[PDB]
Amino acid sequence: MFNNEPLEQIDKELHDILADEEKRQRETINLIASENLTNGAVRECLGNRVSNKYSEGYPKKRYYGGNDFIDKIEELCQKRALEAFNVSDEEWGVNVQPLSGSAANVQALYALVGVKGKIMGMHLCSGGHLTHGFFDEKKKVSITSDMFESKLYKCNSQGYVDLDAVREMALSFKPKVIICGYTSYPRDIDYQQFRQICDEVNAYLFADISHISSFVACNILNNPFLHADVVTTTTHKILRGPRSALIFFNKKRNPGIEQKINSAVFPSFQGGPHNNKIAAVACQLKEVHSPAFKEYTQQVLLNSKALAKALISKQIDLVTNGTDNHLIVVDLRKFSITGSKLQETCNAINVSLNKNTIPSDVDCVSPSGVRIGTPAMTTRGAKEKDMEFIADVLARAIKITVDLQEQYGKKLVDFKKGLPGNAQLQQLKQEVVTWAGALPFP
Amino acid sequence: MFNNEPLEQIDKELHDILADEEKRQRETINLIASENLTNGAVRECLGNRVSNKYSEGYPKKRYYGGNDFIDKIEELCQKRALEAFNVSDEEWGVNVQPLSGSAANVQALYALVGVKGKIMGMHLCSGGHLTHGFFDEKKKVSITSDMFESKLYKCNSQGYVDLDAVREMALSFKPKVIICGYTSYPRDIDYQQFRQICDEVNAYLFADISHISSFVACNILNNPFLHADVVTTTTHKILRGPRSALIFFNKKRNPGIEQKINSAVFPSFQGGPHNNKIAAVACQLKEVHSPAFKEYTQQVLLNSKALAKALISKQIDLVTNGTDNHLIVVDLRKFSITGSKLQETCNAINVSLNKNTIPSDVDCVSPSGVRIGTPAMTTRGAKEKDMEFIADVLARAIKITVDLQEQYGKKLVDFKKGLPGNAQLQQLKQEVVTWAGALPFP
Ligand SMILES: Cc1ncc(COP(=O)(O)O)c(CN[C@@H](CO)C(=O)O)c1O
Ligand SMILES: Cc1ncc(COP(=O)(O)O)c(CN[C@@H](CO)C(=O)O)c1O
Ligand SMILES: [Cl-]
């Protein structure tokens, strides 16, 4: 007593928009550092009937029965996860049930410190995430600033983690957890140095490696598992999995942490796990362990280095003057334009990027930079030689943005009016669409 | 630069378990009240590339661009949701971004009352949900008892909502929100009477209709939208959508509640939405509005009443002695066996049900009932005539549980040891599999 007909027939309206979205994705240079493209195998898992199943609890400890095949899945996932992050099932556990990055951070932080607990994270404007305790003046923007009491460290005017001010704030504030690993940070992290600070104050060490997860797994960047009490990561970014998150906890360093994490997740915050997510994560983590994926992650870095260099060769300033990873932040002051405008300009030419604040930006109102990343384009088969074109396209957009601001003024509402019809952008869009459209596409 | 080969080829290990799980679902009488089976179109949407997209924010108000086809999807979903629940976009708004029911309740409750705020909900043992403020003595089990201050009302010894005790409690406690709509409640709800109580104390009316959502959409049961400030529902249960949740808010009664709900969701709790969930909800909501779905929901009710009647004709007791909805709770005292045991016995015969407490149960240790529901079986084509067989299978299972408790004792560990190899269970399992395996299966 149901409808069997394909999505096409059952709902042609939705299939219209979905087919369109697919086409935009195919015909875009996607530089959103936090984006990637899933293969059909990860998407078969997301569309699998395994999500019919209520499975509150953990393997071998379910509230409901009929959960044998689900137990095997969740365990296959936890194993594949510990293997991928080169870490022993005797020193480290994983929780695979967090529905997304933000959920996973809220949960882990609660487990460690509880309500009213004291947390420290990098400010959003300096490259930290919302769930690292972000707040405005009096307005507690993130639950992590309201549920916990939080203080935000900044980067120095060069764009690097101000480790000294982290100390000067740590002793001042006496936190129970300090978070590192970031939303927009183009360099590697000194986990060791964060460990030093954390000991001095009896604090937990939280590493959110969501953006750099692959580097950590493939031993290309610093290992946080050597110093961290908890590591969290999303699975949809450089990891190239589904939209989901993982919580890692060092038991061999921390008393009953397995308990605190696993019950923060359920039943403190979540109910039924989404088993299709768990299935999809499992499938990707297998790929993650293959050396073919290490080949991919390397290519992500080589592309990022080549893009940084080529942008610099066109006299474009980069925050920290380069990259250690997948992510670049362009400082635009030199051209007297906002990241706000440049985003709008790149939208018109099917180039996906987003505005990003720079150290000298006081407010978050009109950021002077943009964040770009290479994982999605690397997935589509772009190599170093291809980074010059992307760099050139970006430089053309920067210049156009300069011209269009000279005609229509500084206020963004006005600027946007200059975008449609512009002969140049229409020509630049087609170059993009033609090169982007014909790239490998999972 | 990716692996394109089907899940079958790329990962044979996972495909095995998934095919197994699928076979288990086909060969099971699934009586889990909160479970259903999604059609192929809902699963195509869950497996769609729309989840490659970061879409933090709301339609026309995103942080990143390239979000035009996402915006159309989220709006097509919000529309279809208001339509389905027979409510106008001028009095009521929706948020379609909560990842699951628990997140949705935590989010809605914070939006209304904030940290340290006061909430009333039905106790779990009485039929309430974890996110309705659940706690043990000193042990804040659910975040909803920790980040809020919560007090729990019970049901009377007949199994009904003790509206009088709710008053006795509302005046003593003075909460900012009272929750109704339940995990395990076999009767309709007096929303009007909850409204009256909330007025007397200046509290919000929160209705979680996750279990009965379809009934409310098809004007088959009482309408909470008439009296409630906030209505939450999951989409994976009787609604028969994906694993996701909806938050409804009465703006034409409540100030800037549109803002308060929408920002509790993002950026307080969540980050990027899971657009594939949004897409899948959109698709199911279309189906929900069809009169064919009203037919299905009616059948759910008829089947449920037929099952209750048949159980009673075989001298089996039911809490409240019947049902108004999809859900029955069997009282087992009469037989001196637990729900815990019957669950285990029903597992052995591919009959999915879960244990459930009755009004006279002191603790959660060893509940004296089971909860069953009809949505899943109705989806698989079962009609009123078919309920007799299901009732008969349950009666035979109750009897076997009685015989096995007599042979192996009362402690559950010992009892389970009696299950494997039992000639009767193997015979009864086969009867189940034969009839279950050949039922329509989306
Ligand atoms: C470092 C970090 N950690 C967590 C998250 C949350 O992921 P969700 O699945 O969206 O909850 C993010 C998200 N980052 C976005 C911006 O918010 C991005 O585009 O980088 C993150 O960066
Ligand atoms: C009434 C009600 N509200 C919320 C939830 C939470 O849904 P999740 O999607 O699991 O977060 C439930 C869940 N119900 C389970 C038992 O907890 C069920 O089998 O009934 C719910 O009932
Ligand atoms: Cl999903």
PDB file of C-alpha atoms and ligand atoms in Angstrom, chain A residues 54-56 63-64 99 266 269-274, chain B residues 32-35 99-105 124 127-132 179-184 206 208-212 232-237 242-245 326-327 354 356 371, ligand 2:
ATOM      1  CA  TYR A  54      15.508   2.204  15.045  1.00  0.00           C
ATOM      2  CA  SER A  55      18.802   1.405  16.760  1.00  0.00           C
ATOM      3  CA  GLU A  56      19.052   3.572  19.875  1.00  0.00           C
ATOM      4  CA  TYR A  63      17.225  -1.092  23.335  1.00  0.00           C
ATOM      5  CA  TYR A  64      15.425  -2.854  20.512  1.00  0.00           C
ATOM      6  CA  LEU A  99      24.614  13.561  12.797  1.00  0.00           C
ATOM      7  CA  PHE A 266      22.973   9.108  23.316  1.00  0.00           C
ATOM      8  CA  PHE A 269      21.529  14.653  22.782  1.00  0.00           C
ATOM      9  CA  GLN A 270      20.470  12.223  20.036  1.00  0.00           C
ATOM     10  CA  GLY A 271      17.948   9.393  19.703  1.00  0.00           C
ATOM     11  CA  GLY A 272      17.900   6.832  16.882  1.00  0.00           C
ATOM     12  CA  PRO A 273      21.155   6.820  14.916  1.00  0.00           C
ATOM     13  CA  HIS A 274      20.920   7.403  11.159  1.00  0.00           C
TER      14      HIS A 274
ATOM     15  CA  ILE B  32       7.731  -1.161  15.999  1.00  0.00           C
ATOM     16  CA  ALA B  33       5.267   1.698  16.378  1.00  0.00           C
ATOM     17  CA  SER B  34       7.837   4.267  15.304  1.00  0.00           C
ATOM     18  CA  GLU B  35       9.057   2.386  12.221  1.00  0.00           C
ATOM     19  CA  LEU B  99      18.382  16.565  11.517  1.00  0.00           C
ATOM     20  CA  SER B 100      16.222  14.359  13.755  1.00  0.00           C
ATOM     21  CA  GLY B 101      13.425  14.526  16.334  1.00  0.00           C
ATOM     22  CA  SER B 102      15.699  14.904  19.338  1.00  0.00           C
ATOM     23  CA  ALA B 103      17.672  17.795  17.849  1.00  0.00           C
ATOM     24  CA  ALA B 104      14.333  19.412  16.892  1.00  0.00           C
ATOM     25  CA  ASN B 105      12.959  19.251  20.430  1.00  0.00           C
ATOM     26  CA  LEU B 124       9.335   8.312  29.961  1.00  0.00           C
ATOM     27  CA  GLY B 127       4.951   7.379  27.612  1.00  0.00           C
ATOM     28  CA  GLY B 128       7.004  10.546  27.225  1.00  0.00           C
ATOM     29  CA  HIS B 129      10.233  10.931  25.262  1.00  0.00           C
ATOM     30  CA  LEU B 130      13.765  11.463  26.455  1.00  0.00           C
ATOM     31  CA  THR B 131      13.810  15.001  25.025  1.00  0.00           C
ATOM     32  CA  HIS B 132      10.705  15.817  27.068  1.00  0.00           C
ATOM     33  CA  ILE B 179       4.940  19.298  26.364  1.00  0.00           C
ATOM     34  CA  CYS B 180       2.293  16.852  25.119  1.00  0.00           C
ATOM     35  CA  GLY B 181       2.413  14.351  22.243  1.00  0.00           C
ATOM     36  CA  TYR B 182       4.235  11.161  23.128  1.00  0.00           C
ATOM     37  CA  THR B 183       6.500   8.196  22.438  1.00  0.00           C
ATOM     38  CA  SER B 184       4.127   5.555  23.719  1.00  0.00           C
ATOM     39  CA  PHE B 206       4.405  22.318  22.900  1.00  0.00           C
ATOM     40  CA  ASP B 208       5.323  16.644  19.723  1.00  0.00           C
ATOM     41  CA  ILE B 209       3.122  14.703  17.288  1.00  0.00           C
ATOM     42  CA  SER B 210       5.954  12.513  15.894  1.00  0.00           C
ATOM     43  CA  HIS B 211       4.030   9.287  16.476  1.00  0.00           C
ATOM     44  CA  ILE B 212       0.635  10.508  15.320  1.00  0.00           C
ATOM     45  CA  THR B 232       7.360  19.282  16.382  1.00  0.00           C
ATOM     46  CA  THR B 233       7.325  16.014  14.467  1.00  0.00           C
ATOM     47  CA  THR B 234       9.839  13.524  13.077  1.00  0.00           C
ATOM     48  CA  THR B 235       9.289  12.463   9.465  1.00  0.00           C
ATOM     49  CA  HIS B 236      10.465   8.816   9.625  1.00  0.00           C
ATOM     50  CA  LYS B 237       7.569   7.330  11.576  1.00  0.00           C
ATOM     51  CA  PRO B 242      13.219  10.012   5.807  1.00  0.00           C
ATOM     52  CA  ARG B 243      14.940  10.475   9.145  1.00  0.00           C
ATOM     53  CA  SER B 244      14.379  14.190   9.740  1.00  0.00           C
ATOM     54  CA  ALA B 245      12.227  16.545  11.761  1.00  0.00           C
ATOM     55  CA  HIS B 326      -1.584   3.304  15.542  1.00  0.00           C
ATOM     56  CA  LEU B 327      -0.241   2.073  18.853  1.00  0.00           C
ATOM     57  CA  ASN B 354       9.845  -3.393  21.973  1.00  0.00           C
ATOM     58  CA  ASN B 356       7.240  -0.822  27.386  1.00  0.00           C
ATOM     59  CA  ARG B 371       4.371  -1.553  22.533  1.00  0.00           C
TER      60      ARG B 371
HETATM   61  C1  LIG C   2       7.604  11.561  20.462  1.00  0.00           C
HETATM   62  C2  LIG C   2       9.040  11.437  20.008  1.00  0.00           C
HETATM   63  N1  LIG C   2       9.771  12.547  19.770  1.00  0.00           N
HETATM   64  C3  LIG C   2      11.044  12.512  19.369  1.00  0.00           C
HETATM   65  C4  LIG C   2      11.733  11.335  19.157  1.00  0.00           C
HETATM   66  C5  LIG C   2      13.166  11.520  18.719  1.00  0.00           C
HETATM   67  O1  LIG C   2      13.369  11.061  17.395  1.00  0.00           O
HETATM   68  P1  LIG C   2      14.848  10.728  16.898  1.00  0.00           P
HETATM   69  O2  LIG C   2      14.602  10.866  15.416  1.00  0.00           O
HETATM   70  O3  LIG C   2      15.054   9.286  17.311  1.00  0.00           O
HETATM   71  O4  LIG C   2      15.765  11.751  17.518  1.00  0.00           O
HETATM   72  C6  LIG C   2      11.062  10.023  19.394  1.00  0.00           C
HETATM   73  C7  LIG C   2      11.708   8.700  19.219  1.00  0.00           C
HETATM   74  N2  LIG C   2      11.194   7.569  19.473  1.00  0.00           N
HETATM   75  C8  LIG C   2      11.601   6.162  19.642  1.00  0.00           C
HETATM   76  C9  LIG C   2      11.929   5.845  21.104  1.00  0.00           C
HETATM   77  O5  LIG C   2      12.671   6.892  21.717  1.00  0.00           O
HETATM   78  C10 LIG C   2      10.422   5.294  19.227  1.00  0.00           C
HETATM   79  O6  LIG C   2      10.615   4.083  18.916  1.00  0.00           O
HETATM   80  O7  LIG C   2       9.270   5.618  19.558  1.00  0.00           O
HETATM   81  C11 LIG C   2       9.651  10.100  19.836  1.00  0.00           C
HETATM   82  O8  LIG C   2       8.904   8.995  20.090  1.00  0.00           O
END
